[PDB]
Amino acid sequence: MILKRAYDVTPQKVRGVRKRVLIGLKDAPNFVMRLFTVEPGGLIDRHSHPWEHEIFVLKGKLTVLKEQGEETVEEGFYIFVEPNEIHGFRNDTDSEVEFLCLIPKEGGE
Amino acid sequence: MILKRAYDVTPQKISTDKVRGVRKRVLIGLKDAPNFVMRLFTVEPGGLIDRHSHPWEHEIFVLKGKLTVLKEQGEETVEEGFYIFVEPNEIHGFRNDTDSEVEFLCLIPKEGGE
Ligand SMILES: [Os+3]
Ligand SMILES: [Os+3]
Numbered sequence: 001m002i003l004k005r006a007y008d009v010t011p012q013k014v015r016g017v018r019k020r021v022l023i024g025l026k027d028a029p030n031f032v033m034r035l036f037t038v039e040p041g042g043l044i045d046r047h048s049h050p051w052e053h054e055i056f057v058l059k060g061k062l063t064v065l066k067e068q069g070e071e072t073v074e075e076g077f078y079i080f081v082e083p084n085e086i087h088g089f090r091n092d093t094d095s096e097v098e099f100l101c102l103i104p105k106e107g108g109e
Numbered sequence: 110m111i112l113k114r115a116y117d118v119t120p121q122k123i124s125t126d127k128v129r130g131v132r133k134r135v136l137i138g139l140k141d142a143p144n145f146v147m148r149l150f151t152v153e154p155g156g157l158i159d160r161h162s163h164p165w166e167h168e169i170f171v172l173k174g175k176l177t178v179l180k181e182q183g184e185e186t187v188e189e190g191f192y193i194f195v196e197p198n199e200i201h202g203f204r205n206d207t208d209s210e211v212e213f214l215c216l217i218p219k220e221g222g223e
Contacts, residue, residue: 001178001180001181001193001194001195001196001199001201002192002193002194003178003185003187003191003192003193004191004192005190005191006170006190006191006192007190022170022192023168023192023194027194028166028168028194029166029197029218030144030145030166030218031144031145031168031216031218033168033170033192033216052142052143052144054137054142054145054147054216056115056136056147056170056214058172064110064112066110071112073112076114076115076116077112077113077114077115078111078112078113078115078136078137078147079110079111079112080110080111080137080141080142081110082110082141083143085110087110100170100214102145102147102168102216104143104144104145
């Protein structure tokens with residue numbers, strides 16, 4: 001069993017974005033747990049990949065970029081992104097945003 | 110795409126010979142997810158998920174409070190902002206020794222169900 005404070009993990013199309021792989025394929029067989037910290041004004045550009053995302057918003061107000069248009073979510077929201085669905089993320093606030101993001105092994109890390 | 114408040118998922122009361130004082134939400138389940146499932150557990154004060162094992166892993170992130178983790182031997186407490194990886198077939202359990210509700214995200218591969 002691994003028990004650890006997330007922030008202590010060294011971080012690894014994006015601006016103003018810290019990506020931590022908390023549980024990677026180093027340890028886990030099937031899927032990966034990442035922690036993303038988006039500074040004010042940070043951006044993950046719209047993209048699409050042939051694997052899903054499962055996300056939980058931990059802190060702040062997150063702009064979710066969609067195929068057309070956008071939606072704002074906040075702490076305590078989850079997000080499912082189907083494989084190949086267009087998605088991006090932006091921090092349109094004065095405050096840090098943080099979310100958990102999990103992908104299956106085919107997405108690598 | 111699904112974008113929803115986790116608390117809006119109706120929690121199920123979990124009550125077994127090994128679980129007391131626990132509620133569970135399936136946030137992202139097999140209806141949508143091809144590979145793994147996102148659950149949110151709420152442990153009431155004094156609640157217990159006793160030691161057990163299953164042939165799939167857990168990936169956990171603690172959302173709120175102080176979680177007592179029951180290990181193969183002994184116990185360790187973690188808090189909000191900790192993650193936990195439990196290997197397949199590793200003994201593990203959880204207890205809430207505090208006077209407020211504890212919450213954690215818990216993800217399992219689809220072979221574990223929901
Ligand atoms: Os993506
Ligand atoms: Os378990």
